[PDB]
Design a protein around this ligand. Structure first.
Ligand SMILES: [Zn+2]
Length: 1036
């Protein structure tokens, strides 16, 4: 490329070496030979010079001079292995076979015993240079000499055959490496199908192309394309089209570009899933198995997979694994089992194609059960600590589990205790539209039916030559375990321990009689293998009680663990022998080993283990395939109404929602509330307002992003940017997002009424329009047109979405007509859709707050003539300056008067400044912010509201139920609640408030005849009139 003979300045080793290497890199070997001879004349001790001369002489086919040069280089660094190999190669090319073989032997003996030349011979170093004829010969020699059966060696042999264009030998060799493999490799299956194609065996080529795409974790369009070609050559045109259609990750005509649409990586990942969800067909002979997020293959899903394997069920099985997941022995060398990694492309496709899904915890947030899919959630044990909706530690942490139960069609239980706890503590009893059957855990079958074969294999895999008793210690995650395992050192029994992968790795096993159970052995097999079980707070004890063996509940830290996790059971009512010290554990072990007595109470077996007869897996499988209804827990579901309040900001909307919740709490219905848990967990005051809900409220929280296709992301982003109605197809595309999201959150649930109570959040307006309900209702708490043009642009999208609801309910009749005037004609909403419903009040709490809470009251209210009260925020909208000015004028005519103000705010200091101006320091008192103002509101004589803007003046009704009358400025908020019949209204000026004070002092409080129960009965009757009859379920 470059001459570099440019520097004709001679005799310089630097320039000579520069020119020589440039000649070698340009493959001008004969020309570089003379320059390296000149360098050796100058520096006759450069090891690199002898290295290059050996390379040059070998490229020049001077094999004798190559050996001489490589030898002179090797004695410059006898620890260099590449030199010794090149010595042997050039001797082999020379014909000196024996001298070369002694060289190869030195190369082998001086190599680390897992470097490739150790397990695969000297041919691996030929392969590193592309010398495939010599690599194949050495591979074949090393296989025959070692009788090796390593699949990796057969793979390297097939690679050599492939680069020699001996395709038939390459294909058959790859098939051996695959057959000899513990788990079939997707990459190997492609190399085998590729070689079979080049050999023109199309049936074998299609066979292994099919294997490759079935087991490929990542999407490979190339492999789908090659499979489709081979299927076409075979004449299978239908399957050829399917593979051709799948030769593109995205099949749909989105008419949009992914680069301009996708903002976040999660959006791209979810877009592939959503297409798979909508387009891929279910395989009626496919079963997916997942246990503990693929971290291991154990528990109930493993027992079901094992049962259906040994009974030869006609299925293909997909087992979900992670990196480094240990594989049980009975699953190796099985072509009917496909291992795919969680979260991969194959994971998403198989979640959308497997007809039968089996899990013991939960699928991730994006999983949606397709129609015709069977999802069996087995769970993973009898619960013993605080669990689910009572765990406040991460807010709404159980939400995806409650989601998964709503996605499930079948659920199994080990005992009625677990049935009650799961259905109640995950808030899904009335919503769960599937089937729950009490079959007992199939994992217990692995303990009952341990074979003498497997028992002997576990014994030799452990190192137990004698039939000494086996003691199994399996505690839960939370040093003492070191002290406890020394104290249990004994020759009388074999001690087996299983704990957390972290605990077992830093155990220091010497000085210990203990054996850490290998991770390839199931815990239920260990229960049937052992003779005595030691545990503390693990649900594995209830797998044990039906095995007629002694158990020990060793609970040294019951105080600490109960304080942290809250245990269901007291110490005296746990199973087996309850021990609090380690010396008592050893004493109890030897007592029971010698006596042979059982120590498990039969009352415990009747509570938790009455279903364990070693046949639960047949019951579960027949239940899942809808062939055995004998174990179903049939019960009556309540009808359900679903609500949305918002993010529970403490405001007028939340206070009205809480009052409505208190009024309907004993209606015999399931009141469901949908929330966004992340929007509430941030604010301490939002959580406090959320915690005031009645305890019977079923609560579901959205988890994660909404899965959307490519065009669905564009359509949504466009709508949430322009808020316009565009066409029928555009609207249907947008609404398809929210019907899918309703399914993701609720499954096949159905409700009587879906009530969007907030009326603001656009996401929840479109979502509630798609809930399967008999009636869809959305509230209006304000003048929506003023809120739209004042603060919230997205309210335009809400107005263009009122078409998707049946009723639009305002919180007052005045507000209703205002909303009709501003929205009905402008947005094509029929007048008949609009209605109103007065906000409910909690009469019992108002009455209880005023009469109870005998609290510290200022001495200046306790003694006076006429008392006037006002609660506000000093936000200028309350306008307390016009109040104190009307007071100064009203003190003239009548003087035996006092006034009190509650609250705090910005315009505070200006109030105390005005206190001295009117010289009323002893006639007006500015009390603090009171956490319970109802004692003051009852004991006062007049409640004054001088406000200029009032949104939800509910204190006005509150005071009137307490029997203390009202004077309030005639603004739109105070008139919407009072009108002309309740309370006394005045103009919004100083003179109007003085007239109201003076009119009260002559004539008294207005004789409005306000009945709090009449207002409550009217408000609730209007509410119940808005609900549905026995009408038909639908979505919009
Ligand atoms: Zn409807």
């Amino acid at each position: 490329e470059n001459k570099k003979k440019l520097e004709a300045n001679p005799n310089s080793p630097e320039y000579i070496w520069e020119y020589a290497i440039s000649l070698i890199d340009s493959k001008q070997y004969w020309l570089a030979q003379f320059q390296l001879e000149k360098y050796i004349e100058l520096k006759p001790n450069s090891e690199q010079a002898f290295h290059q001369l050996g390379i040059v002489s070998e490229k020049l086919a001077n094999y004798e001079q190559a050996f001489i040069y490589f030898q002179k280089a090797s004695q410059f660094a006898p620890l260099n292995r590449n030199y010794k190999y090149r010595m042997g190669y050039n001797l082999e090319k020379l014909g000196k076979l024996n001298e070369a073989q002694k060289c190869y032997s030195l190369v082998i003996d001086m190599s680390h015993p897992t470097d490739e030349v150790a397990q695969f011979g000297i041919g691996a170093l030929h392969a590193k240079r592309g010398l495939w004829d010599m690599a194949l010969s050495a591979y074949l020699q090393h296989q025959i000499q070692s009788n090796s059966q390593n699949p990796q060696l057969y793979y390297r042999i097939g690679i050599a055959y492939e680069r020699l264009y001996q395709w038939t030998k390459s294909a058959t060799t790859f098939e051996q490496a695959i057959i000899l493999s513990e788990i079939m490799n997707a990459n190997w299956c492609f190399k085998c199908g590729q070689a079979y194609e080049r050999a023109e065996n199309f049936e074998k080529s299609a066979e292994f192309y099919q294997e490759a795409v079935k087991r490929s974790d990542n999407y490979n369009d190339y492999w789908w394309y090659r499979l489709a070609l081979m299927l076409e050559k075979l004449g299978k045109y239908e399957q050829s089209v399917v593979a051709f259609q799948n030769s593109r990750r995205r099949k749909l005509a989105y008419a949009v570009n992914p680069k301009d649409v996708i903002k976040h990586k999660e959006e791209e990942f979810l877009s592939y899933y959503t297409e798979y969800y909508e387009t891929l067909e279910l395989d009626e002979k496919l079963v997916l198995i997942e246990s503990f997020f693929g971290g291991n293959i154990s528990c109930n899903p493993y027992a079901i997979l094992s049962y259906m394997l040994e009974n030869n069920y006609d299925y293909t099985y997909v087992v979900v694994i992670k990196d480094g997941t240990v594989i049980p022995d009975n699953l190796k060398f099985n072509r009917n089992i496909i291992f795919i990694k969680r979260g991969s492309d194959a994971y998403l496709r198989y979640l959308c194609t497997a007809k039968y899904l089996i899990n013991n915890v939960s699928f991730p947030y994006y999983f949606i059960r397709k129609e015709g899919q069977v999802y069996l959630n087995t769970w993973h044990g009898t619960p013993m600590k605080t669990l689910g909706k009572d765990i406040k530690s991460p807010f709404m942490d159980h939400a995806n589990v409650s989601r998964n139960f709503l996605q499930a069609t079948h659920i199994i239980s080990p005992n009625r205790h677990t049935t009650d706890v799961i259905l109640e503590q995950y808030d899904v009893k009335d919503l769960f539209s599937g089937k729950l059957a009490e079959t007992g855990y199939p994992r217990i079958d692995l303990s009952f039916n341990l074979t003498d074969k497997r028992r002997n294999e576990i014994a030799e895999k452990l190192g137990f030559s004698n039939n000494k008793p086996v003691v199994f210690y399996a505690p839960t995650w939370r040093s003492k375990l070191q002290y406890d395992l020394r104290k249990l050192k004994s020759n009388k029994y074999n001690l087996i321990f299983r704990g957390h992968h972290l605990v077992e790795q830093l155990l220091e096993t010497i000085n210990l009689d203990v054996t850490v159970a290998p991770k390839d052995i199931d815990s239920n097999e260990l229960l049937g293998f052992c003779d005595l079980l030691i545990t503390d707070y693990s649900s594995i004890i209830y797998d044990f009680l039906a095995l007629s063996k002694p158990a020990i509940s060793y609970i040294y830290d019951y105080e600490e663990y109960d304080a942290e996790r809250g245990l269901y059971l007291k110490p005296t009512e746990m199973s087996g022998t309850v021990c609090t010290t380690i010396t008592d554990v050893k004493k109890t072990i030897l007592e029971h080993i010698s006596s042979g007595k059982s120590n498990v109470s039969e009352q415990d077996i009747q509570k938790y283990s009455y279903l364990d007869d070693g046949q639960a897996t047949k019951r579960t499988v027949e239940f899942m395939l809808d062939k055995d209804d004998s174990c179903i827990y049939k019960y009556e579901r309540r009808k359900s109404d679903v609500f949305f309040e918002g993010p529970f900001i403490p405001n007028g909307i939340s206070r009205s929602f809480l009052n409505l919740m208190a009024s309907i709490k004993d209606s015999g219905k399931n009141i469901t509330l949908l929330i966004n848990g992340s929007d509430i967990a941030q604010d301490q005051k939002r959580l406090e307002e959320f915690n005031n809900l009645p305890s019977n409220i079923t609560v579901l929280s959205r988890v994660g992003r909404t899965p959307m296709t490519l065009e669905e992301l564009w359509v949504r982003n466009k709508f949430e940017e322009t808020y316009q109605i565009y066409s029928e197809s555009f609207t249907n595309t947008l609404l398809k997002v929210y019907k899918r999201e309703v399914r993701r959150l609720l499954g096949n649930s159905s409700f009587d009424n879906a009530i969007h109570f907030e009326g603001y959040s656009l996401f929840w307006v479109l979502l509630f329009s798609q809930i399967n309900a008999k009636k869809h209702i959305i509230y209006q708490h304000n003048d929506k047109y003023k809120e739209w043009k004042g603060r919230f642009p997205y309210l335009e999208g809400v107005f263009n979405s009122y078409v998707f609801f049946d009723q639009i309910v305002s919180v007052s009749e005045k507000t209703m007509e205002n909303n009709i005037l501003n929205l009905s004609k402008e947005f094509n909403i029929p007048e008949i859709k609009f209605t109103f419903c007065n906000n409910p009040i909690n009469i019992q709490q108002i009455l209880s707050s005023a009469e109870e809470n005998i609290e510290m009251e200022s001495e200046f209210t306790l003694f006076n003539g006429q008392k006037f009260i006002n609660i506000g925020r000093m936000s200028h909208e309350k306008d307390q300056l016009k109040l104190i000015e009307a007071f100064y004028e009203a003190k003239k005519a009548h003087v035996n008067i006092r006034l009190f103000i509650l609250g705090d705010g910005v315009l505070k200091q200006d109030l105390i400044n005005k206190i001295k101006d009117l010289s009323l320091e002893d006639s007006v008192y500015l009390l603090g912010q009171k956490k319970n103002p109802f004692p003051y509101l009852k004991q006062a004589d007049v409640f004054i509201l001088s406000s200029n803007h009032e949104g939800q003046p509910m204190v006005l009704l509150e005071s009137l139920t307490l029997g203390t009358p009202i004077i309030a400025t005639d603004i739109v908020g105070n008139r919407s609640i009072l009108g002309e019949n309740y309370g006394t209204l005045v103009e919004n000026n100083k003179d109007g408030l003085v007239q109201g004070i003076n009119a009260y002092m002559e004539k008294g409080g207005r004789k409005d005849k306000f009945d709090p129960y009449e207002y409550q009965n009217d408000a609730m009757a209007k509410f119940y009139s808005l609900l549905a009859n026995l009408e038909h379920h639908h979505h919009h």
